Enzyme design. Structure first.
Site, short mmCIF file in Angstrom:
data_model
loop_
_atom_site.label_atom_id
_atom_site.label_comp_id
_atom_site.label_asym_id
_atom_site.label_seq_id
_atom_site.Cartn_x
_atom_site.Cartn_y
_atom_site.Cartn_z
N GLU A 263 -49.54 -6.41 -28.69
CA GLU A 263 -49.30 -6.60 -27.27
C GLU A 263 -48.86 -5.34 -26.51
O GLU A 263 -49.47 -4.96 -25.52
CB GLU A 263 -48.25 -7.69 -27.06
N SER B 43 -50.85 -13.86 -19.25
CA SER B 43 -49.83 -12.95 -18.64
C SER B 43 -49.00 -13.62 -17.51
O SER B 43 -48.27 -14.59 -17.75
CB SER B 43 -50.53 -11.68 -18.12
N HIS C 182 -52.53 -6.43 -25.28
CA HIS C 182 -52.44 -7.43 -24.22
C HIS C 182 -53.68 -7.35 -23.32
O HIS C 182 -54.08 -6.24 -22.93
CB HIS C 182 -51.14 -7.20 -23.40
#
Length: 566
Positions: free
Chosen positions: A347, A214, A467
């Site tokens: 995601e 990230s 994610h």
């Protein structure tokens, strides 16, 4: 975050402190560093392995008082033994479970873990940079435990760096020496310490892999872009992000004033007077108020965070980002080291929580103008050109007459992650020696083993691989438990930590000593490739064409009349 999850977390917090005590041993050890001796301790894991643990190693001067907002300075050396048997505090930040501010300005530490202090050959050195949008995160083991990794014969290092306004405030006035990116400069100094000290822990300084997820992936990429770190490490893994993602840099030079004003500043908008207020203000007050800095215009244009990585307005000695990230790829030393990149399979499924407090956001897909890349869209998002680009986005993700929540989270997969990955690959191809880049897609879904981000994204009882779902298989966390060795979860831990250690050692991620990789032929991407090939990591490991490719190309078509901006 709900009261029930609050109390549930409080109880796991109590559980984890007692587990940490029980898993500690009396075997202390002393290692050399260039700053003096450090005392570590051996610890246990729930899989009955053990590892040497050095926590709270300082790589910078504590950035308090006159050092606040400024570039980090090298630490003061000591002659004696520094106690590194306990973790230091995290960067000042808002706790996502509680909502209260926690941490300290004294946060510039790193941790070093290894199953063997005196290996017979020097080992691969793995450096993890945590994510958290540059506003939250830590190297504490209740979130990033090295327990899985220490099964392999590597040296693993988890760093901290300054978050939020304290990490990324930026002022135009060259006299005040707050250009910005202090948090990235923290990361640089940690790297230089790792370069020069990892040998004392049995690490090979000529084989260093930096990786992150990230904001941690964006950071890893930034560390591959800057001239500040040239030759410092030898492999990179970009997990669900990079520096040209739209959340990964912002021009925040005006927002200092806004933040001072929110915190009680009386006076005018000039940098000096703003800085002096911000320098005397309580760290917790500044961090608590960061949520309110962004205007409604900015949020509408998908500006995610007030303070973050920025193009610095003037060049200093420790400058990290002198031009926009896209411009930096064109001269990046990092382009010429072996790279692995990848994403999860859903995601944007992360944004469910946000979608529930803001149902109206799904109506944005009616024209999709707000998701057109900023550099292409006009101010009000009302220009005929903008509605036309919006339409290409809409054709790519909206499946029915009316837009759905899944259409939305699907778009977010591409807006925040896949499209920026596609742009970086193509741009990189035009400026590289030809070192390989490998693609993975993490497609493994389990609810039996989880990590704390699932609490944040309200991910309870939700199917699909969001994610941050992949962190569960790299690091121990206080929500984890011991899994049977025949379980699909445990196997994935083995496969994941195995591939990463394989890539870290050789610069090539393939091994037939990994269960399931028998019929895998994992090739790097070529500039000639019209279609990206990736290893899809599910219950089985399968090379496939990237499924998101057709949508990726649709996004690319928005740049038809603006190929220079691509």
């Amino acid at each position: 975050v709900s009261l029930m999850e609050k109390l549930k977390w409080k109880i796991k917090c109590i559980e984890n402190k007692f587990l940490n005590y029980r898993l500690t041993t009396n075997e202390t050890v002393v290692a050399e560093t260039e700053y003096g001796k450090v005392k570590g301790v051996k610890r246990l894991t729930v899989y009955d392995d053990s590892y040497y643990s050095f926590e709270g190693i300082p790589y910078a001067q504590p950035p308090v008082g006159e050092l606040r907002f400024k570039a980090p300075q090298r630490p003061t050396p000591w002659d004696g033994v520094r106690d590194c048997c306990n973790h230091k505090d995290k960067s000042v930040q808002v706790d996502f479970i509680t909502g209260k501010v926690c941490g300290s300005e004294d946060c510039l530490y790193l941790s070093v873990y290894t199953n063997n202090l005196n290996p017979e050959t020097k080992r691969p050195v793995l450096v993890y940079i945590h994510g958290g949008g540059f506003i939250i995160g830590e190297n504490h083991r209740d979130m990033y435990g090295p327990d899985y990794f220490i099964k392999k014969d590597v040296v693993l290092i988890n760093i901290q760096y300054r978050l939020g306004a304290l990490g990324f405030l930026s002022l135009n006035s060259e006299d005040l020496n707050v250009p910005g990116n202090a948090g990235l400069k923290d990361q640089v100094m940690a790297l230089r310490w790792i370069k020069n000290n990892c040998a004392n822990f049995g690490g090979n300084p000529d084989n260093i892999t930096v990786f992150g997820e990230s904001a941690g992936a964006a950071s890893t990429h930034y560390m591959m872009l800057t001239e500040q770190t040239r030759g410092l490490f030898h492999r990179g893994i970009l997990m669900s992000g990079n520096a040209i993602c739209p959340w990964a840099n912002t021009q925040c030079q005006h927002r200092a004033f806004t933040l001072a004003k929110l915190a009680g500043y009386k006076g005018e908008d000039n940098d000096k007077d703003v800085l002096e207020f911000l320098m005397k203000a309580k760290p917790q007050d500044l961090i608590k108020l960061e949520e309110k800095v962004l205007t409604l215009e900015e949020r509408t244009n998908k500006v995610m965070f007030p303070f973050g990585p920025t193009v610095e307005p003037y060049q200093t000695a420790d400058c990290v980002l002198p031009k926009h990230p896209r411009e930096m790829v064109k001269t990046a030393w990092g382009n010429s080291i072996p790279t692995m990149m990848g994403n999860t399979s859903y995601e944007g499924l992360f944004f469910t929580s946000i979608l529930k407090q803001m149902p109206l956001l799904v109506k944005e897909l009616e024209t999709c103008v707000n998701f057109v890349p900023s550099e292409l869209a006009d101010a009000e998002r009302t220009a005929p050109e903008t509605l036309e680009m919006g339409a290409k986005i809409k054709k790519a993700h909206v499946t029915g007459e009316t837009p759905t929540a899944d259409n939305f989270m699907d778009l977010c997969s591409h807006f925040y992650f896949w499209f920026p990955m596609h742009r970086l690959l193509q741009l990189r191809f035009n400026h590289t020696s030809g070192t390989p880049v490998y693609l993975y897609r993490f497609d493994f879904d389990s609810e039996d083993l989880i990590n704390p981000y699932r609490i944040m994204r309200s991910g309870r009882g939700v199917k699909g691989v969001s994610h941050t779902d992949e962190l569960t298989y790299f690091f121990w966390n206080q929500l984890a438990k011991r899994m049977p060795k025949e379980s699909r979860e445990y196997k994935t831990i083995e496969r994941m930590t195995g591939i990463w250690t394989q890539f870290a050692t050789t610069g090539n991620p393939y091994s037939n000593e990994i269960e399931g990789m028998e019929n895998v032929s994992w090739d790097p991407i070529e500039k000639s490739d019209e279609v990206y090939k990736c290893l899809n990591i599910s219950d089985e490991l399968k090379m496939i064409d990237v499924p998101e490719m057709g949508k990726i190309k649709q996004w690319e078509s928005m740049f038809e009349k603006h190929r220079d901006l691509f």
